[PDB]
């Protein structure tokens, strides 16, 4: 798998995160991110994907050491952490064939796992519209705890 790069944007209170909603296979909510182009540096990919999906430019705010990275089915996803972006910021995707909507969510209200179906004696997990975001939530809470307290 080709690696993906993007950002976790937080507001000034550190309470809220910016998610984007896609279409079809990507119909639910996730952090803004996408696949790296040939010979493109990780920080340049993250700024390009975030600007395409939100219309906000992170280039002057990226810190090279501040990121969460996960490997999911042998594909690497690295999201740079960008705190302190005001909630009254005007966001507008470029790529509206790809992005349905953009919204702020409370970090403490987001799920960090999907629910089983043990009440139905059935295997697997119940659908959840935050499925693409969920793997990063626990690592994000732990990162904010260590850096800020």
Short mmCIF file of C-alpha atoms in Angstrom, two decimals:
data_model
loop_
_atom_site.label_atom_id
_atom_site.label_comp_id
_atom_site.label_asym_id
_atom_site.label_seq_id
_atom_site.Cartn_x
_atom_site.Cartn_y
_atom_site.Cartn_z
CA UNK A 1 0.00 0.00 0.00
CA UNK A 2 1.09 3.57 -0.85
CA UNK A 3 1.39 5.59 2.50
CA UNK A 4 -1.25 8.25 3.36
CA UNK A 5 -0.62 11.63 5.07
CA UNK A 6 -3.00 14.26 6.52
CA UNK A 7 -3.84 16.10 9.79
CA UNK A 8 -5.70 16.10 13.07
CA UNK A 9 -6.78 19.78 13.44
CA UNK A 10 -7.87 20.84 16.95
CA UNK A 11 -9.48 24.09 18.13
CA UNK A 12 -8.16 26.54 20.76
CA UNK A 13 -9.78 24.65 23.69
CA UNK A 14 -8.22 21.27 22.66
CA UNK A 15 -11.80 19.82 23.13
CA UNK A 16 -12.80 19.56 19.45
CA UNK A 17 -11.43 17.95 16.23
CA UNK A 18 -12.18 18.66 12.54
CA UNK A 19 -13.59 15.69 10.56
CA UNK A 20 -14.60 15.41 6.87
CA UNK A 21 -17.37 13.20 5.36
CA UNK A 22 -16.76 11.46 1.98
CA UNK A 23 -19.04 9.56 -0.46
CA UNK A 24 -19.72 5.87 -1.40
CA UNK A 25 -16.92 3.57 0.04
CA UNK A 26 -15.85 6.64 2.08
CA UNK A 27 -19.45 7.62 3.12
CA UNK A 28 -18.69 8.26 6.85
CA UNK A 29 -16.51 10.66 8.89
CA UNK A 30 -12.66 10.59 9.02
CA UNK A 31 -9.62 12.83 9.33
CA UNK A 32 -8.51 14.64 6.12
CA UNK A 33 -5.73 12.56 4.42
CA UNK A 34 -4.75 10.94 1.08
CA UNK A 35 -2.12 8.98 -0.85
CA UNK A 36 1.43 10.32 -1.44
CA UNK A 37 2.47 11.26 -5.06
CA UNK A 38 5.78 9.85 -6.49
CA UNK A 39 8.82 11.77 -4.99
CA UNK A 40 6.51 13.96 -2.72
CA UNK A 41 7.76 14.60 0.87
CA UNK A 42 5.37 13.54 3.78
CA UNK A 43 4.75 17.13 5.00
CA UNK A 44 3.97 18.37 1.43
CA UNK A 45 1.44 15.52 0.87
CA UNK A 46 -0.27 16.30 4.26
CA UNK A 47 -0.68 20.01 3.37
CA UNK A 48 -1.89 19.22 -0.20
CA UNK A 49 -4.52 16.68 0.92
CA UNK A 50 -5.74 18.87 3.78
CA UNK A 51 -6.03 21.93 1.50
CA UNK A 52 -7.96 19.88 -1.20
CA UNK A 53 -10.39 18.52 1.40
CA UNK A 54 -10.93 21.58 3.71
CA UNK A 55 -9.54 24.67 1.88
CA UNK A 56 -7.31 25.43 4.90
CA UNK A 57 -3.52 25.61 4.41
CA UNK A 58 -1.47 23.93 7.24
CA UNK A 59 1.97 24.46 5.71
CA UNK A 60 3.04 27.20 8.18
CA UNK A 61 1.74 25.26 11.23
CA UNK A 62 3.09 21.72 10.71
CA UNK A 63 5.60 20.53 13.32
CA UNK A 64 7.75 17.73 11.88
CA UNK A 65 7.95 15.79 15.17
CA UNK A 66 4.22 16.06 16.17
CA UNK A 67 2.14 13.23 14.55
CA UNK A 68 0.33 9.92 15.16
CA UNK A 69 1.15 7.11 12.80
CA UNK A 70 -0.68 3.75 12.49
CA UNK A 71 -0.28 0.77 10.21
CA UNK A 72 -3.65 -0.54 9.08
CA UNK A 73 -3.64 -3.69 6.90
CA UNK A 74 -0.01 -3.07 5.97
CA UNK A 75 -0.62 0.57 4.87
CA UNK A 76 0.91 3.44 6.84
CA UNK A 77 -1.28 6.48 7.81
CA UNK A 78 0.51 9.45 9.42
CA UNK A 79 -1.61 12.42 10.71
CA UNK A 80 0.25 15.60 11.78
CA UNK A 81 -1.20 17.23 14.93
CA UNK A 82 -2.26 20.94 14.39
CA UNK A 83 -3.72 22.50 17.62
CA UNK A 84 -5.16 26.02 18.15
CA UNK A 85 -7.18 26.55 14.94
CA UNK A 86 -10.27 28.79 15.82
CA UNK A 87 -13.76 27.27 15.42
CA UNK A 88 -14.93 30.28 13.40
CA UNK A 89 -12.46 29.41 10.58
CA UNK A 90 -14.15 29.22 7.17
CA UNK A 91 -13.62 25.77 5.68
CA UNK A 92 -14.59 24.91 2.04
CA UNK A 93 -13.46 21.81 0.14
CA UNK A 94 -11.99 22.17 -3.31
CA UNK A 95 -13.05 18.64 -4.21
CA UNK A 96 -16.86 18.61 -3.63
CA UNK A 97 -17.24 15.54 -5.84
CA UNK A 98 -15.30 13.90 -3.02
CA UNK A 99 -16.39 15.73 0.20
CA UNK A 100 -19.99 15.89 1.44
CA UNK A 101 -19.51 17.94 4.59
CA UNK A 102 -16.94 19.24 7.16
CA UNK A 103 -17.72 19.61 10.91
CA UNK A 104 -16.23 19.97 14.40
CA UNK A 105 -16.74 17.04 16.86
CA UNK A 106 -16.19 16.76 20.64
CA UNK A 107 -13.22 14.42 21.30
CA UNK A 108 -14.76 13.11 24.56
CA UNK A 109 -18.02 12.11 22.72
CA UNK A 110 -16.31 10.21 19.81
CA UNK A 111 -16.08 6.41 20.01
CA UNK A 112 -12.65 4.77 20.36
CA UNK A 113 -14.03 1.27 19.27
CA UNK A 114 -17.17 -0.10 17.54
CA UNK A 115 -19.85 -1.96 19.53
CA UNK A 116 -20.17 -5.75 19.29
CA UNK A 117 -23.50 -7.59 18.79
CA UNK A 118 -23.29 -9.85 21.89
CA UNK A 119 -26.97 -8.97 22.75
CA UNK A 120 -27.95 -10.71 19.47
CA UNK A 121 -25.56 -13.77 20.00
CA UNK A 122 -24.05 -12.74 16.62
CA UNK A 123 -20.31 -12.22 15.62
CA UNK A 124 -18.76 -9.01 14.30
CA UNK A 125 -19.33 -5.30 14.84
CA UNK A 126 -22.30 -2.89 14.46
CA UNK A 127 -21.96 -0.17 11.70
CA UNK A 128 -20.57 3.15 12.97
CA UNK A 129 -20.31 6.37 10.97
CA UNK A 130 -16.95 7.21 12.60
CA UNK A 131 -15.27 3.93 11.46
CA UNK A 132 -12.39 5.71 9.56
CA UNK A 133 -11.58 8.00 12.61
CA UNK A 134 -11.89 5.42 15.40
CA UNK A 135 -8.34 3.88 15.23
CA UNK A 136 -6.75 7.30 15.96
CA UNK A 137 -8.96 8.34 18.95
CA UNK A 138 -7.27 6.46 21.82
CA UNK A 139 -3.71 7.35 20.54
CA UNK A 140 -4.85 11.04 20.21
CA UNK A 141 -6.23 11.19 23.80
CA UNK A 142 -2.94 9.64 25.11
CA UNK A 143 -0.82 12.08 23.06
CA UNK A 144 -2.77 15.17 24.33
CA UNK A 145 -2.47 13.84 27.97
CA UNK A 146 1.32 13.55 27.71
CA UNK A 147 1.88 16.96 25.92
CA UNK A 148 -0.70 19.09 27.83
CA UNK A 149 -2.21 17.26 30.86
#
